[PDB]
Amino acid sequence: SKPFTLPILTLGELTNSRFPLPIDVLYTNPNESAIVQCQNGRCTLDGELQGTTQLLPTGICAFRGKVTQQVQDEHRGTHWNMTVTNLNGTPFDPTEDVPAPLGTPDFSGQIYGVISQRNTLPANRAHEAVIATYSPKFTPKLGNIQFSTWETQDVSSGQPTKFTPVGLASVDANSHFDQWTLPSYSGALTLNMNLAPSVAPVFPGECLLFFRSFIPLKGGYGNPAIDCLMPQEWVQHLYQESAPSLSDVALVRYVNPETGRTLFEAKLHRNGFLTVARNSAGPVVAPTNGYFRFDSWVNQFYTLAPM
Amino acid sequence: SKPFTLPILTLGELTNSRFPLPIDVLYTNPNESAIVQCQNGRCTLDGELQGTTQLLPTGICAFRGKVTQQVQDEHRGTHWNMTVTNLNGTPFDPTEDVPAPLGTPDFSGQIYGVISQRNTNTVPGEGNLPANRAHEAVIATYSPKFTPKLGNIQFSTWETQDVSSGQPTKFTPVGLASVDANSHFDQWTLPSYSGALTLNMNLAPSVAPVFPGECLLFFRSFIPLKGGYGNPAIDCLMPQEWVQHLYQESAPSLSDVALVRYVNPETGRTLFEAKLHRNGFLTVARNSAGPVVAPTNGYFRFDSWVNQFYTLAPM
Numbered sequence: 001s002k003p004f005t006l007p008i009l010t011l012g013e014l015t016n017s018r019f020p021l022p023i024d025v026l027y028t029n030p031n032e033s034a035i036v037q038c039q040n041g042r043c044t045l046d047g048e049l050q051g052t053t054q055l056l057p058t059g060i061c062a063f064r065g066k067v068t069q070q071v072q073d074e075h076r077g078t079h080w081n082m083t084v085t086n087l088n089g090t091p092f093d094p095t096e097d098v099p100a101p102l103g104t105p106d107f108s109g110q111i112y113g114v115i116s117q118r119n120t121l122p123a124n125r126a127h128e129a130v131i132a133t134y135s136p137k138f139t140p141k142l143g144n145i146q147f148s149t150w151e152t153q154d155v156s157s158g159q160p161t162k163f164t165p166v167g168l169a170s171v172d173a174n175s176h177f178d179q180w181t182l183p184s185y186s187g188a189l190t191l192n193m194n195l196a197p198s199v200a201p202v203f204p205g206e207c208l209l210f211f212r213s214f215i216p217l218k219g220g221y222g223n224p225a226i227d228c229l230m231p232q233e234w235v236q237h238l239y240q241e242s243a244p245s246l247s248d249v250a251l252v253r254y255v256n257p258e259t260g261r262t263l264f265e266a267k268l269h270r271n272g273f274l275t276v277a278r279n280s281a282g283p284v285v286a287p288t289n290g291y292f293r294f295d296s297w298v299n300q301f302y303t304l305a306p307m
Numbered sequence: 308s309k310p311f312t313l314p315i316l317t318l319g320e321l322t323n324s325r326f327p328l329p330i331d332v333l334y335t336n337p338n339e340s341a342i343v344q345c346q347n348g349r350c351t352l353d354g355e356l357q358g359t360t361q362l363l364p365t366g367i368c369a370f371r372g373k374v375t376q377q378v379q380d381e382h383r384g385t386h387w388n389m390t391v392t393n394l395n396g397t398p399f400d401p402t403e404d405v406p407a408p409l410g411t412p413d414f415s416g417q418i419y420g421v422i423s424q425r426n427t428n429t430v431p432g433e434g435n436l437p438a439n440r441a442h443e444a445v446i447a448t449y450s451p452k453f454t455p456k457l458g459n460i461q462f463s464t465w466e467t468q469d470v471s472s473g474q475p476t477k478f479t480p481v482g483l484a485s486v487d488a489n490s491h492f493d494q495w496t497l498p499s500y501s502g503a504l505t506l507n508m509n510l511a512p513s514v515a516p517v518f519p520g521e522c523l524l525f526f527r528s529f530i531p532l533k534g535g536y537g538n539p540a541i542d543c544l545m546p547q548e549w550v551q552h553l554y555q556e557s558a559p560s561l562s563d564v565a566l567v568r569y570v571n572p573e574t575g576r577t578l579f580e581a582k583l584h585r586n587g588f589l590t591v592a593r594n595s596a597g598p599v600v601a602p603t604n605g606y607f608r609f610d611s612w613v614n615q616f617y618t619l620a621p622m
């Protein structure tokens with residue numbers, strides 16, 4: 001049986017699977033009331049990608065497509081309707097068993113980035129843009145979204161268009177940032193489909209452990225973060241290896257290689273997420289040289305050493 | 308001896324190691340007159356990172372630091388000086404044996420992206436949260452003010468005032484501002500990391516075919532443009548996932564050349580073969596420039612260690 005492994009990458013060598021950001025800290029929040037059911041950075045321990053998860057770091061919260069129409073918003077700014085394809089350029093087939101094109105953002109908010117176009121030497125243009133994923137016009141599962149620009153006219157219809165995500169536009173009350181609220185991929189009255197399952201601890205005293213990244217803001221006050229269940233390099237590693245899962249729960253140790261000492265241990269669950277025995281919220285303070293090492297297969301009743 | 312391996316990733320599952328872009332096509336250009344000596348995407352087959360290469364896809368052509376002040380520059384736009392640290396936030400130590408902070412761009416051009424800031428100081432009335440701002444920015448890596456090895460660079464903005472002094476600053480690369488003649492885009496011309504008239508140091512070595520009939524094989528990505536005409540590309544020697552894989556594995560190199568086959572897994576058939584050289588680059592037996600037109604399911608598979616005199620089957 002092909003032995004299970006994790007990459008040997010320290011926190012400072014890992015990136016977020018839910019937004020193109022480095023991992024900044026490990027993080028817990030035991031009193032979280034939301035159902036945690038993110039769709040990017042989802043991969044089983046035996047290498048099955050789930051939700052909208054794909055392998056490219058460049059594909060996370062990316063879109064590819066063509067602009068079809070300009071619409072002016074009542075207040076301020078210009079909106080552009082965009083028909084989206086798969087990230088590899090092939091037509092998105094809504095009948096495929098995915099929630100949305102792979103790479104589609106998996107949270108409610110105003111995602112800030114750059115729209116760029118290269119016409120079919122060709123002419124080019126790029127502008128700052130915002131995609132409101134909570135918008136009724138955000139319907140990637142139906143093959144179309146809307147983005148807004150400060151630019152009022154210089155966006156071309158019928159030309160190949162790329163969205164490069166950069167951060168959030170805002171996290172103020174009216175910007176509906178909630179990292180655990182899924183978009184309605186087909187619009188507000190339609191049920192999301194083919195989702196990666198929710199994740200949660202099942203053992204008393206345990207809480208989820210997240211890989212946290214701080215995300216840039218176009219403006220306003222805030223220090224927003226995006227928490228992923230596993231970094232993108234773990235998704236890539238699990239996918240490559242496809243090691244059989246020998247129980248539902250792997251025991252992993254967070255080790256300081258310079259001392260060889262275990263800093264803490266965690267459960268790595270079959271569906272691809274971590275729990276720890278910790279009764280507090282906040283970052284995990286751990287040496288920079290640290291990384292997770294697979295120890296053994298255990299079960300749901302294994303008692304983790306308290307952090 | 309730990310066996311050498313490559314990841315099993317098709318072209319559509321690979322990203323560029325010199326700019327945050329997917330790999331679009333494999334590419335050759337036998338008649339290239341430039342010395343090929345890029346500094347990102349440099350890793351030996353036994354896992355030694357070289358040049359300015361680091362592991363994070365988010366770190367490639369990124370900067371982290373602090374704006375010091377707005378500055379006057381001859382060229383169009385509003386200009387800003389920014390100190391740069393290592394990407395992990397620690398001070399960059401110029402005495403380290405690297406050309407520049409890891410992640411620094413390794414080509415001449417106007418690199419377009421977004422500068423964002425999150426203030427250090429927080430406001431009680433805003434729930435003890437910091438103020439933020441982001442704007443488009445351009446870094447001209449050929450500028451005499453581009454001195455990342457000295458811990459300082461300059462960027463320009465269309466925005467005329469809303470960039471804060473003394474605040475933590477991130478550059479997220481997006482593409483190029485221009486490839487007009489006056490924007491000096493040349494993917495094989497290195498920046499002067501310490502400024503005009505200084506010799507770059509600690510470089511990853513140049514790469515070249517040594518065997519007649521062979522040429523370099525590149526992983527090519529098309530890079531976005533803020534404006535103007537063009538279809539610019541960035542060619543890397545190995546994709547970022549190969550850098551990450553080689554670094555993990557650190558398998559001993561058993562000769563100077565690994566024979567690899569580009570395989571179509573749907574047929575199991577070899578489409579062509581290539582030499583994967585110890586220093587971390589590919590050559591093929593091809594006598595033309597341009598894309599390699601190959602089925603989308605394709606990937607390289609390690610076959611055996613050979614020697615420099617191995618004759619490749621013509622592509």
Ligand SMILES: C[C@@H]1O[C@@H](O[C@@H]2[C@@H](O[C@H]3O[C@H](CO)[C@H](O)[C@H](O)[C@H]3O)[C@@H](O)[C@@H](CO)O[C@@H]2O)[C@@H](O)[C@H](O)[C@@H]1O
Pocket residue numbers: 218219220221438439440441469
């Ligand atoms: C907290 C504040 O956030 C950002 O300002 C925005 C405002 O942005 C507008 O004004 C600023 C200058 O004040 C700048 O010109 C920016 O380009 C422009 O769009 C505006 O969005 C208001 C709307 O209520 O919110 C914030 O004040 C940022 O630019 C500021 O530097 C500052 O960090």
